Symmetry: D2
Subunit: 260 residues, 4 copies
Amino acid sequence: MLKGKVAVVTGSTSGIGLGIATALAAQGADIVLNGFGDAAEIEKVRAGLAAQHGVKVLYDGADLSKGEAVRGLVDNAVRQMGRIDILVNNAGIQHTALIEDFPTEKWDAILALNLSAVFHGTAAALPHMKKQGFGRIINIASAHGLVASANKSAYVAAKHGVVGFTKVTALETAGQGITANAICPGWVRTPLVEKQISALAEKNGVDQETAARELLSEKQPSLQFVTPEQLGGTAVFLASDAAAQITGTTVSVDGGWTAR
Amino acid sequence: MLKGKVAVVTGSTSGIGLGIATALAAQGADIVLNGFGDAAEIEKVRAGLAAQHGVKVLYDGADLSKGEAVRGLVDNAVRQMGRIDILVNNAGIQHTALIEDFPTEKWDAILALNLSAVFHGTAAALPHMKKQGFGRIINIASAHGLVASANKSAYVAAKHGVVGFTKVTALETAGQGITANAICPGWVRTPLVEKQISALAEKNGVDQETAARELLSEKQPSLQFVTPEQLGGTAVFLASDAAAQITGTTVSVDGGWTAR
Amino acid sequence: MLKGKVAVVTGSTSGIGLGIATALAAQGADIVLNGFGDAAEIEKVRAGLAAQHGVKVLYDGADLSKGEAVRGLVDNAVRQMGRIDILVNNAGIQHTALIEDFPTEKWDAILALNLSAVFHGTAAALPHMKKQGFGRIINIASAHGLVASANKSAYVAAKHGVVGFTKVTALETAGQGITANAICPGWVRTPLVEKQISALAEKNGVDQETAARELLSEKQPSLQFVTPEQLGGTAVFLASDAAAQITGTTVSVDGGWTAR
Amino acid sequence: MLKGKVAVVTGSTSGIGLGIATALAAQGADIVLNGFGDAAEIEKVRAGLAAQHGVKVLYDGADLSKGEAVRGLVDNAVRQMGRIDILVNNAGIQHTALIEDFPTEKWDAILALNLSAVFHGTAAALPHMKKQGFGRIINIASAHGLVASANKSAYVAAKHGVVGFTKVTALETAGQGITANAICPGWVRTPLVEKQISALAEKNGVDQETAARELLSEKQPSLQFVTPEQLGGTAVFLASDAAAQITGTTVSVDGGWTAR
Ligand SMILES: NC(=O)c1ccc[n+]([C@@H]2O[C@H](COP(=O)([O-])OP(=O)(O)OC[C@H]3O[C@@H](n4cnc5c(N)ncnc54)[C@H](O)[C@@H]3O)[C@@H](O)[C@H]2O)c1
Ligand SMILES: NC(=O)c1ccc[n+]([C@@H]2O[C@H](COP(=O)([O-])OP(=O)(O)OC[C@H]3O[C@@H](n4cnc5c(N)ncnc54)[C@H](O)[C@@H]3O)[C@@H](O)[C@H]2O)c1
Ligand SMILES: NC(=O)c1ccc[n+]([C@@H]2O[C@H](COP(=O)([O-])OP(=O)(O)OC[C@H]3O[C@@H](n4cnc5c(N)ncnc54)[C@H](O)[C@@H]3O)[C@@H](O)[C@H]2O)c1
Ligand SMILES: NC(=O)c1ccc[n+]([C@@H]2O[C@H](COP(=O)([O-])OP(=O)(O)OC[C@H]3O[C@@H](n4cnc5c(N)ncnc54)[C@H](O)[C@@H]3O)[C@@H](O)[C@H]2O)c1
Ligand SMILES: [Mg+2]
Ligand SMILES: [Mg+2]
């Protein structure tokens, strides 16, 4: 379990990040939620997790496109929660276009959130974790941090960068009670993916579910979506003492995507 | 938990395999132990696990250098235990030499046990797992399934081969309720490693613990050995429902060995 | 240019090996051919090659499924041709079946040729190359030495093993004027592949070309076959002085196969 | 040979880029040089290459930290040279510090040049290359695009990003006459590396060559630096027709660095 520990999960107001925050709360960790969406729904999520699991849950609406706001999220988590044991760098965005059609604003935004926010959050966390002699940094990269798809240049570059950055984090902290690893999921049916399902159904003139199956079949041999609950379990495992010597690596949760 | 499941762990009379078997037993799985050793000592291990964890524990001493014995171990497991849910292919040997000095006899032995036993065990298990709609194949590869060292050609080749074979097992079973993955440890201070520590101590004319630290420092950034307990916890995670979409991949438990 | 250097190409009587042997001949290297087939055609090829490029081209029908025959091929290349500069380990075979249906004989034969022949070939070549202070070992692995496909367990395992073995070869020879690398081709339209195209045509009820394009389309983004000519040019590059510090690595010639 | 072709080589006033430009000029390619340093020396280099190899050589001093300047470099190369056949994305910078000490300005500067300039350059080049039905994009990544070192977070992230980006480039252009690949060098003794040798020398209290040897032995099994001339040869090879199906891959020129 994780009783007495504090976890900050970026982009945990929905999707994968909410599944990870929920799993960590279920292990007894105090939680800092973060991310956008509807404020009433966010408060319900926050109060609900605290009540259900009997842990402290805070919400910090920092916009993680700004480096100082990311560092502020971590530093304020320590101020309010008293420590930071687990940092899950999860917030991310997507945009698809051919490289020559890829707007520079979109390239910049994807690098800022999907890559640079991992840097800033890690930089802010590490002095605390070093003083603690304990930390777990868990970066949510992607199958796209190990391999590529067409039309996803900024996202694939960013996710590859996160994988490299995770390795450096591990090497700088090796032996200090701190590990850093990157979870690399295949498809998870969140709004990030639903948008691309919708696009494919339009392009192909089929219904939504036919597009969903095709999207899966192209990439994911199992023909099964990964779930936020599975990814929460994986984060819980990396946070555990069994994973004390798992550091600087990727854990692919992808139904066979990268095996072929 | 793994109540009502049966796990076979090859080479589980000592070292890593025993740590894995013990961890799975503690989650409530029935266990088939395998490997060599003293009758009284093995029986104490077997009877002690059964009594401690309240599970059935069989010992089958089959020599896994012969394909027919490996398949017979899986057969005997199903015969005596009723089913097979988890196969951990762990038994392995080492031999160090320059490639041009490498005894063909040792090349052959290392491939037969370190690689071919995985094929034979997997082949025997899969029809059961496929009929059940459930299975977990957990191969114990190495950091040497992903990178190399000098003087370990048969071992690196076999372990690389295990990684490839794992991927194919996964693709053949995708979506069928079965996963196959390879745990890739760094240094674990078993007799397999102690022999190399001893060899270094004599070569460099220092004491055992200086040789121990140098063996670690050369490969493993954390400067800490991985433990059988940690690898057992890693196996338990791979066996769990959270890992239902982790397939065809490697899990490096190596203290940063492969990150640099 | 490779004037006054000697290259052994295993399995060079046909397909990829022939392409490599040719390209190296055209660079002024002495050749030892090897492989199976009508001895009249083999003299025609061997003579044609010797005449056209002004090089000594020998032939040796050694069956490389046997360790001592492989070690013989090399030593007899040295006795006859004076030296060995380039060893290309290329001979290999394929067999498709589910793991549980894979005959042990086929498993064993695929390992013996596709993997163990590389060990035996290398073990023999090394003493000469080392005393010479120059050598190039070029292993013909595959995309399947890096990723996997369903139904190719022995092939994928041996080919991963070659990649691993190549790395160890590099490390043991580092700085000694010798490099070892593995070329990893995607689909090359040889009989080894024609066989599989034919099977797919029958399975789907389509002509040979619809089957070929679909085979390509599945794996190879460029939708173009790799050629023995190209693989030959790749071998030539690896043999050049520019590649002096290219060691222990793979060169993927695969039209994008491993990129996604 | 590359007669009639135009190559743009970023940061080719010094080091690896100059080696690559030189190699390409020698094959008959017209060259656009770029980068900083002494203007009189740059002119000697530019006029020298032009006269030595009988090709047109232009200097464009665009500061590639600005995306518009990178696109301007490519667009003006097409304007002044008639076409663009080969784009070598080479310019890069280094800064070493622990993650928590790493200045944001240096993080941003490294991503902008070492990663974003690769996007901007590629984006400008692609419409031209697609029109022409021929293109070669050669990205100078690093061993640090595939593995990590402590204290190099921005550089390792950027270089991993370049490896990912190269893959997406390959997939988007697959079959169209264009390839995109990433050359991944180990140590090359440029001023980028000399600065590190100097810091090591002062850290350890040794002379420069003791520090050079130690920097070498830490990472590079061959104990030999890679040369700009070798990298030029590799670039030339990738520009060749033999590499027409080499796309979306890395070519490691690293003396065994990533093998272990
Ligand atoms: N869905 C998938 O198939 C998939 C697969 C692999 C990896 N990933 C990665 O998982 C992570 C989460 O993705 P998801 O699919 O759950 O997406 P999602 O859109 O459902 O969730 C994104 C979360 O990030 C938050 N967010 C977005 N911009 C933010 C900002 N500027 N500051 C703070 N928060 C911000 C959102 O409010 C939300 O909480 C991403 O990094 C994504 O790249 C997703
Ligand atoms: N110790 C390490 O640092 C390390 C690191 C990475 C991977 N590994 C791998 O982990 C596995 C276990 O290694 P370990 O260090 O615990 O070794 P170990 O020598 O301590 O134990 C090996 C086990 O396998 C059994 N065994 C040996 N030959 C057998 C045979 N022919 N048939 C049946 N059983 C046999 C032994 O009886 C013993 O139970 C091996 O596959 C090894 O390659 C070990
Ligand atoms: N064809 C492809 O798409 C492809 C792709 C990637 C890698 N490869 C690899 O390239 C290599 C050659 O393949 P290919 O397509 O040219 O096959 P091929 O069937 O066209 O040629 C096989 C060659 O090896 C020889 N050979 C077979 N068994 C031998 C033995 N026991 N001893 C000596 N020689 C023997 C044959 O005589 C022939 O010359 C193999 O290692 C294969 O795994 C092929
Ligand atoms: N030296 C090595 O060991 C090594 C190893 C692997 C990869 N690399 C990579 O090789 C590339 C070149 O490295 P090098 O060692 O030759 O370095 P170098 O410093 O000797 O050369 C760098 C070149 O880039 C130019 N440059 C710097 N900033 C620029 C800017 N804003 N706009 C345009 N040009 C600019 C410089 O003027 C110079 O021409 C880099 O991408 C580097 O990361 C270097
Ligand atoms: Mg793939
Ligand atoms: Mg390494």
